[PDB]
C-alpha cells in the first residue's frame, strides 16, 4: 500500500501539473542515496 | 455530437496533421519553434478532457483511432449519425458513448473563426491543394470556396442531355466522322475544350456553343486558346489543326466581355463562361475544328454550391467525382492492410453504407435493385449507383450521397493512427 | 469509475477465493449515461431546475434518478444454497475521472453471527464532493473504496443444522448498498494454489563478498618536492 | 558464478576480486523488490 | 563526424532555407514574427564560435560554405568520409578537422524527432516536394517515407527482362507493328501506360499482365483509365482509341480488390499495382490497344526501400533516375560559375568520386573501364556508369551509388553560401 | 451472451480438454503435478469431475436444441458486434461469462504469432478469432495449400483437375496450378516440345498468399498419388540450369537442385525459365507451408473466394467433431440432432435475407457435420446477394464448432 | 561475450517462446497456471533487474530485439564474435557494449542443466521437431543428439564419388535405361531408396550395395520394405514392380542382424544402415528393380556428429541442407519486411558474411572467386558455395559453415520481436 509515495503522489496527476515530473527528477537523485547507495550485505544462514 | 461538432475536431485533426508536417525535421534541440509549441498546444486540445499538458503525442493520438475504428464500426454506437436529422440540423444530442464524449466537442472559436474563413475567399494566392475541412463545409452547409482557388474542371463535370459522358466522349471524338455532327463540350485536367467535327469542311462564318449546366460556373485566367486535334492524349479525328499565317483572324465573344477574344494568339487570356453562351466566329473554313481553352480555372464567386450540393446533376444516371476523398483514403487503408482489418473494415462500411440509406427513405427498407459495384472507399463509383435508383427520388439520392461523403471524409480523417496490437 | 443505483456481489456456496464483494464485475454493467470528465460531472451538478411546488432537483441528480434500482435482496439471492442473479444487468453513469481505489480485503469464516462492516460510498457522498471541489482549477481525486471478501471456509466444519438459508443471504446483504465503485476487474492479484509456485515467485538473487571491503578514507597523499637539482630547461621547438 | 562488482581497472592478481570470495543467496524476495540495492555494486565501482 | 552528425546539420542548413523562404518579403518593423524568431536563432545555432544576435547573417553562412569548399575538396580532410563504413555504422570517427568541429554535431531533439517523423508518414498532407533530408535517410538508413506523398512513376523505373528502357521504347511504339508484338509497361510524369500492340485485330476476352518490378510498388488514387495511343505526346501507332455507345464494358481487376474496375468511364477510381499483375478484360476485340491510368501515384507503404535502396534493379546496365539531387544543385552551381571554380571544382569532384569507388573494391584500386561519360553533377548519368562495371559485382556497385549520392546532396546544401573573395 | 463471452468459455473448455490429456497417465500417488492443479482449478471456474462435465452438456445441447432458447446467437447481429443482449436463459446465465484475463491474454496472443514453434495444429479457439473478429495466425505456423484452394477464373476445381491432368494432351494447353497436402503443382502440359526461354505464371488468388521453408523444387509428373499425362520428368548432367524468380526475391531460385529453399509466393507471379525444351512440364514446390503475415484474413473471411460456386474447406471441423458425433450415436440421439440442426441452420440463414424467408432452391445434399459441403451449397445461391452467403458460412461455422467443443461429454440420461 | 554465454541466453529465449504457445488462450482470469508462472518468471529473468517492473511484456521483448538488431548489424560491435576464437573457445573477451552487459550472460544450471541433457538423449519420446538449441549445441560443440529424435533421411544426403546428388538423380531414374546402369541409392522424406535398373532383365541371385557414407548412420523403426517405381512422386523408368503370388522369396541382410530380412511383407522391420553393404538376394530374376525403405528414420546412437560436424562432407562441390534455419527464420523476415529493413539488413549481412570468411583465412583477405547466388537467408545455398572454394583447405571451408549457421541461428531467435519505429 505504501509503494514509494515520495515518488508517486497519487494525490496528484502528473497531466496538469507538469511540476510533479520535475520534483520526480529531483526525487529520483535522492533515492540514490537513500536505497541505491543501501548495500545488502547480511543474509543470514545456518548449517544444515 | 453536433454535426458542427465533429467538423470541428476533424478541423483540429487536420490542423494536428499540418503542424506535424511543418515540424517535420525542423525539431532542432535547444530550440522551441513556434510552430512546435503550437503542435504540442493542438495535442493538449485533443486529450482535453484528460490531460492538461503532454509530453509525447504517439499514444494519445493511436489512442483516438483505435477507439475511434471501434466506433464507426459497431452501428449500435455510431447511429445516431447515420440518421437524417444529424445532416439536417445542429441540435446538440445527447449520446453515452465514450469516444464521442472524449474527443468530440467544440474546437473552433466562434465567431473570429468564421470572419477568417471569409477574408480568405477574398485572399490573393489560397491553398491549391485544400483541406478536407473547405470540402466538408461545402458539401454540407454549402459555404462558399475560395474565389482564386484552382480546380480542375473535369471533376466539375456531370452528366447532361447533350453528351452522357466526359471520359465516354473520348471513343467516338477518335472515330473518323460521316456526317456534320452536333458540337462537343469536353473537359480535362488542365484544359477545357469544344468543337465541332465533320467530314466535309465547314463554312467560315458564325456559330454558337451552348456551355453545359456544370462548365457555366467556370472562369480562366492565364489562358491560351488554341486549336487542337488531342483530348488526353488521344487523337480526335474530324479536326484540322492545320492554318496559315495568312488566314483571317478567329475570334470568340462571351456575354461578359464586350470585346472580342484572340484564338491562336500568344496573349493570355481572362474570361468568364458564365452567363451563357460562346460565340465563335470562324475566320476561315475548317473541316471539323476543335478549340481549346488552357490556363487556371477557378469556380465563379458564390457558385460553388452548385458542384458541392450536386444541383449540376440533372438527370439520371450521371457520371460523378468524388470531392478528392479517395486521395485522403490512402493513409488510413494503408493503416487497415497493416495489420489485416481491411477485410473486416469492408464489411462494416457496407452496413454503415446500408443502415445511412435506409433511413433516408420511408418506409425504412433498402430500396429495390441496390446493388454495389465498388467497396465503401471508391466513392465516386458508389455515388453514381446511389444517383442511379429510379425508385427514390431525386433530392433523397442526392442527400444519401451528401452525407455519406461527410461520414468518408470522417474516416479518412480520424483513423489514420490505427494501430490495435 | 461508475455511478449505480445499487449493487454488491454474492457468490454463496462458491468453493473459489472470492465470495462477497462490495463492487461487481465489469460485464454486468449497463451504461445509459457518459460523464466526460470532472468539469462537466460539475457542470451538471449545478443545472438545477424548478420541479414542482416546492421542490428542486438538478441534471447530475435527475440523471441519477433515470437509473433503475434492483432490490438489495435480488443481489443476496439463491437457490437451494448457490447464489444465483435472475436480475439483468445493473443500470449506471459512467464517469471518466481519475480515481483511486482503496483496497480492503475480509475473511469470511463461515460462522454467520457478526455481520461484517464494509465500507460502502453513497451518490449523496459524491455530490458532496462535487461540491467541496466546485471552484478548483485542476480535478480533485476521488477515492473510491471496495471491499473483496475472501473464502476461508475450513476452519468451519460440521453437518448440524443451525439456521435458515434466509439468515445467511441476509448476512451476506452487507456486502450490498454501494452507490458509487470500481469493477472488481481493476484488482489485480495472483493467486496460487500450490505452495510450490507462490515460492518460485517469491526467489530472487543478491551475491554478497563475504567479508566487507575495507575503505580507507583519510589517506593523505600528496606531492613532496626533493632538494635542490639540476634543473633543465626544455628547450624551446627550433628550426 | 561470477563478481558481481565490475572494476574496470588493471589490477595484480594477488589482490584482484575473484568469485571465491563472494557467495550468491537465493531469498523470498521478488527481483523487483531487491532491485534498486543492486545498483550499489554500480556506485561502489565508479567511486571507489 | 558521425554520418548522423552530417544529416542532422544538413537539415539544419535545410532548414534555415525552408525559414529563409518564410521571412522573404515578411520582415516588418514592429513585427515579431514566429517565423523570424525561428530563423534568428537558427542561424545562431551555425557557429560555435559566438551566439550574439547576427546583424548580418550573410557573413556567417558564407564563412560556412567557404569553409566547406575547402573542406570537401582535400582529400587528406574529407577522406574519411569516403570509407565503406562511414555510410554503414554510426561510431564516430577519431578525426580533428577546423570544419567538422565548428559544423558538424547532433542538432536534432531526441527522441522527439523520429516521434515527429513517423507521425508524420501518417499525415493526410505532406510536402509534395521534400527535403533533401528525407531522401537522405531513405537512401542511408532505409526509413520510411509517407504513406501519401505523390512521386512520378517514370522515375521509379529501372530496367526489366522484358524491355531494356522506358524512354527509348517510345520510338519502337511509334512504329506500325510488324504482327502482334508482346505486352509493353512505359511511365510518363503523370500517368502509367500499359498494353498489347498488334496490326491484325486480337480477339475479345481475358488478358494476363505482369505488372513489372519497379511498378508493382505504385498505388494510384483519383484516377481515370481509358484507351489512349499518346506517350510522352509522341503518337504510339498498332493501337486504336475507336469505340461506341455499344460496345461491351472492358474491365479489369487487381489482386488487391474483389470488385471490377471499369475502364473508359467517367468514375474516378483508387487501386494498388502491388498486386502483383493485372487482369484486363476486352468487351470487344481491338486493332491493338492500350490502357492509360492517370491520377495521383503513391509508392506503397512500407515500399520506398525498394526504390531509394537500389533494390529494384536487376539488370545490367539499367536505366537510373538521380533521386532528383540535379534540382538541389541548381544553385550551387550557379554559384560557382560566378567566381569560375566550376572547372577546379569539377577536378576535385572526380578525384572524389575515383577515390571513394576505390575504397568498395578489395583489393584497393581502380576498375579497369571505369568511363566517366559525364561530369559530377549529371548524377543521373555517372550512376548508370557505377551499375554497368561487370568488374564488381551489383551490391558494391549499388553501395557505390547510393554513398556518391549522398555525398553529393551533401554539398549541394553547405555550398549554396560560397563566395572565396 | 456475447459473442466474446461465448469464446471466451470455449477456450476454457478446450483448456479443460487439454489440460486432461496432460494429466492422462501422469496422476501419480504422493505427488500433485502441477498440471492436474490447474485442471483442477480449472474445473472449478467452470461449475468426481465427470458428473459436472455431463450436466453441462446436457444443459448444451438442450440449449442449442431449442430454436427459442438460443434463437438470439442465429441473429446477423450475434456475429457482428461485442454488444451485450438481453437474455435470460439458466444455461448462459450459469455457463457463459468472461472467462480469459484482459489485457494480458490478448498480449500473449499476439507475442505467440511471433513464436518460433508454435502449435503444429492448433485448437479451435485461434481458428474462431480468425474467422469471426479477423485475426491475425502465427506467422510459423503451417497449412496443407490444398485447403487453402477456392476456384478461380482458369479451373473450377482443385482435386476434380486431376482426371484432366490423367488425359493425354490434344495440343499445347494453358497452365495450371494445383495444390497436394504436403506442395505446389504448377506447369504447362503438351503433346509437342515446348522450346526454352521465359514463362510468366501468374499465381492464382488462394495461393498468392502462401510462403515456403525448407523446400525441394523439382519436375515431377504425380499429383496426389496419380500420372499426370504431358508431361516428362526427364533431364541430363548436361542440360542447362533450369532457374526461376518471384519479385520478394532479388536471385534466381534453382529448380531440380539438392539445395532447401525458402521462397514467397506474394509477389504475385512465379517468372520460370526453362533450359532445355521438353515436352510438357510440371513443376514441384515441397516443403514447409505458412501464411504470409497479415494475409490470414483472406482464407478465414472467405474474401479469397471470387467465383460461383466455389469450393470451399471445412477449416478443419470435421476433425472436431468426431467425439461428439461418437457420443451421440451410443444414446440414439443421433437423429433428433441431425434434425434440430436441420433447423438451427434454416433459421440462421433466414435473419440473414430481408424478407425473412427461406431462399429460392434451398436443398441441403449433407447432414449438417459435412460442413465443407454444406458451405458449398450456401455459396451457390446466386438469388441471394454474395456476401451475405459468405457470413451465413463463417456464422454457421461457429455455432457448429461451439458445439463440438461443448456437447462432447453428452449422455442424456 | 562466451559463445556459450550466447547459446545459454538463446535457450532462454527459446524458453520464452515456447511458455509463450503453452499460454496462448491458457490466460484465465481466477488463476495463475504454473505454465503462465514459469513464462512471467522468464520475462523477469531476461531484462537486468535495473529495468523494474514488467507490465506489458511486449515491451522488454521488443526492446531487446531491437539492440539486438543495431547490434549484429555493425560490424563494429558485433565484430568479436566473429573472429575464429570465439567458436572454438569458451575465453571471456574483453570487449565492451552495452547490448552484451545486459542481455547475454550465463543463464542455465550447472551441472545440473548439462546431466538433464544426458537423461533426454536416452528418453522414450523426444521433440520431434527440437529447438535450435540442441541443434546449435551440436554443430557448435559437437555433442550428442536423443537417440529416438527422428530426421528425414534427404536433409543426411551429401554428394559421394559416384552420384553426386539426391534430387538430380530424379531426372535420370526417369529416363529409360541404355543398359544395366550401376546401382542408386536415394532419399525422400520419408523413405530410402535404393536399386539397379536396365533395359535386359537381371538374374536372380546376390547383389551387393555399398551403402553411402550419409547413410551409412541411419536407423529405422517400424518400416516396410518393397519393390516401388516412384522417387518422390516422379516415376522411375528401367525398373519392374511385378510379382507373382508364388514368386521366390526376395531378402535382404545387413551387417548387424544374422536373420535375413525379408521384401515385399507385411512385417514391420527393423535394422540399421551401419556396419557394412547391403547383401540383397533377388528371387526371382526382374528386368530392373527398386527396392524402398519406408518407416521411421533416426540417426544412429552417437553418430550424429557425422552430419553436424559437416564431417560426411567427401567431394567438392557437394550438396548440403540448412539444418533447418530457414524454418525458424520465417518470423524474423516477415518482422524485416514489416518495417521496411530487409533490404538495409541484407547488406549488413553480406558485410557480416564476409568479414567472418575473411577471419579464416591468412592473410586476412576475401579469397577470390567467391560470389554468392543466393542472401544471407538461404543459408543451403551459401554454405554450397563457401564450400565449393577450391583455393581454401577443406576443414576451413567445413568451420566457416558451421560458424555462419551458428550466427545465423542466433539471428532466428533474437530478432523476431524487432519494430523499430
Same mark, same amino acid.
Given at each position: #500500500?505504501?509503494?514509494?509515495? #515520495?515518488?508517486?503522489?497519487? %494525490? ?25 547507495? #543501501? ?6 544462514? %545456518?548449517?544444515? | ?51 492538461? @499538458? ?173 486549336? /487542337? ?10 479536326? /484540322? ?118 433511413? @433516408? ?61 | ?74 443481489? *443476496?439471492?439463491? *437457490? ?37 462492516? *464494509? ?62 465503485? *470500481? ?24 551475491? $554478497? ?14 606531492? $613532496?618536492? $626533493? ?13 | ?48
Amino acid at each position: #500500500k505504501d509503494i514509494y509515495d #515520495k515518488f508517486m503522489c497519487i %494525490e496528484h496527476d502528473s497531466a496538469y501539473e507538469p511540476s510533479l515530473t520535475m520534483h520526480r527528477v529531483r526525487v529520483i537523485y535522492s533515492m540514490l542515496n537513500d536505497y541505491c547507495a #543501501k548495500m545488502i550485505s547480511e543474509v543470514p544462514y %545456518e548449517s544444515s | 455530437m453536433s454535426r458542427q461538432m465533429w467538423l470541428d475536431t476533424s478541423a483540429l485533426l487536420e490542423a494536428i496533421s499540418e503542424y506535424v508536417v511543418r515540424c517535420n525535421g525542423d525539431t532542432f534541440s535547444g530550440l522551441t519553434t513556434g510552430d512546435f509549441n503550437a503542435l504540442s498546444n493542438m495535442f493538449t486540445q485533443l486529450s482535453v478532457s484528460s490531460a492538461g @499538458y503532454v509530453s509525447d503525442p504517439r499514444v494519445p493520438l493511436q489512442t483516438m483511432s483505435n477507439m475511434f475504428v471501434s466506433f464507426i464500426t459497431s452501428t449500435d454506437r455510431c447511429g445516431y449519425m447515420l440518421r437524417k436529422t444529424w445532416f439536417n440540423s445542429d441540435t446538440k444530442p445527447t449520446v453515452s458513448d465514450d469516444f464521442i464524449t472524449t474527443y468530440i466537442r467544440p474546437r473552433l472559436q466562434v465567431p473570429m473563426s468564421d470572419t477568417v474563413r471569409q477574408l480568405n475567399n477574398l485572399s490573393l494566392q489560397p491553398s491549391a491543394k485544400p483541406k478536407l475541412y473547405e470540402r466538408q463545409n461545402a458539401i454540407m452547409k454549402g459555404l462558399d470556396i475560395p474565389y482564386s482557388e484552382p480546380i480542375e474542371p473535369c471533376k466539375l463535370f456531370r452528366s447532361v442531355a447533350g453528351q452522357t459522358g466526359n471520359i465516354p466522349m473520348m471513343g467516338i471524338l477518335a472515330t473518323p466522322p460521316a456526317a456534320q455532327q452536333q458540337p462537343f463540350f469536353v473537359a480535362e485536367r488542365r484544359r477545357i475544350l469544344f468543337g465541332i467535327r465533320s467530314n466535309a469542311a465547314i463554312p467560315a462564318g458564325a456559330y454558337q456553343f451552348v456551355v453545359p449546366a456544370w462548365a457555366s460556373v467556370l472562369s480562366v485566367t492565364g489562358a491560351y486558346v488554341y486549336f /487542337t486535334n488531342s483530348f488526353f492524349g488521344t487523337i480526335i479525328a474530324g479536326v /484540322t489543326a492545320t492554318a496559315t499565317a495568312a488566314d483571317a483572324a478567329t475570334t470568340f465573344t462571351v456575354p461578359t466581355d464586350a470585346n472580342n477574344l484572340p484564338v491562336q494568339t500568344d496573349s493570355r487570356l481572362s474570361f468568364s463562361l458564365g452567363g451563357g453562351n460562346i460565340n465563335l466566329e470562324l475566320g476561315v473554313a475548317k473541316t471539323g475544328f476543335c478549340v481549346a481553352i488552357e490556363g487556371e480555372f477557378t469556380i465563379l464567386a458564390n457558385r460553388s454550391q452548385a458542384y458541392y450540393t450536386l444541383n449540376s446533376i440533372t438527370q439520371t444516371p450521371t457520371s460523378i467525382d468524388d470531392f478528392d476523398v479517395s486521395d485522403f483514403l490512402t493513409t488510413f487503408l494503408s493503416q487497415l492492410r497493416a495489420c489485416g482489418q481491411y477485410e473486416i473494415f469492408s464489411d462494416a462500411m457496407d452496413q454503415l453504407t446500408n443502415s445511412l440509406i435506409t433511413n @433516408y427513405m420511408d418506409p425504412p427498407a433498402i430500396p429495390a435493385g441496390l446493388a454495389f459495384t465498388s467497396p465503401w472507399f471508391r466513392f465516386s463509383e458508389r455515388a453514381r449507383t446511389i444517383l442511379a435508383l429510379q425508385n427514390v427520388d431525386l433530392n433523397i439520392r442526392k442527400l444519401i450521397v451528401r452525407h455519406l461523403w461527410v461520414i468518408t471524409s470522417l474516416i479518412a480523417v480520424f483513423g489514420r493512427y490505427y494501430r490495435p496490437n | 469509475f461508475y455511478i449505480v443505483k445499487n449493487s454488491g456481489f454474492v457468490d454463496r456456496g462458491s468453493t473459489g477465493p472470492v465470495i462477497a464483494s462490495s463492487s461487481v464485475y465489469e460485464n454486468v454493467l449497463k451504461v445509459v449515461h457518459t460523464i466526460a470528465d470532472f468539469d462537466a460531472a460539475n457542470a451538471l451538478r449545478l443545472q438545477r431546475r424548478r420541479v414542482d411546488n416546492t421542490s428542486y432537483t438538478d441534471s447530475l441528480s435527475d440523471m441519477f434518478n433515470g437509473l433503475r434500482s434492483i432490490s438489495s435482496s435480488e443481489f *443476496v439471492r439463491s *437457490v437451494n444454497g448457490r447464489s444465483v442473479f435472475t436480475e439483468g444487468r445493473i443500470d449506471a453513469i459512467k464517469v471518466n475521472m481519475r480515481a483511486k481505489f482503496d483496497l480492503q480485503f475480509i475473511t469470511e469464516e463461515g460462522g454467520y453471527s457478526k455481520p461484517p462492516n *464494509v465500507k460502502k460510498l453513497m451518490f449523496s457522498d459524491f455530490l458532496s464532493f462535487l461540491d467541496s471541489h466546485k471552484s478548483d482549477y485542476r480535478p480533485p481525486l476521488l477515492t473510491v473504496p471496495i471491499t473483496i471478501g475472501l473464502n476461508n471456509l475450513g476452519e468451519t466444519n460440521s453437518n448440524t443444522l443451525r439456521m435458515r438459508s434466509e439468515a445467511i443471504d441476509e448476512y451476506f446483504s452487507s456486502y450490498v448498498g454501494a452507490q458509487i465503485l *470500481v469493477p472488481i476487474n481493476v484488482v489485480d492479484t495472483r493467486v496460487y494454489t500450490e505452495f510450490s509456485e507462490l515460492r518460485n515467485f517469491f526467489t530472487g538473487d543478491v551475491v $554478497i563478498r563475504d567479508d566487507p571491503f575495507d575503505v580507507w578514507d583519510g589517506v593523505k597523499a600528496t606531492y $613532496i618536492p $626533493i632538494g635542490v637539482h639540476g634543473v633543465r630547461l626544455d628547450p624551446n621547438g627550433d628550426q | 558464478p561470477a563478481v558481481p562488482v565490475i572494476f574496470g581497472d588493471d589490477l595484480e592478481p594477488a589482490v584482484r576480486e575473484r568469485a571465491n570470495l563472494y557467495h550468491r543467496y537465493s531469498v523470498p524476495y521478488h527481483q523487483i523488490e531487491l532491485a534498486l540495492h543492486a545498483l550499489a555494486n554500480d556506485l561502489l565501482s565508479i567511486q571507489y
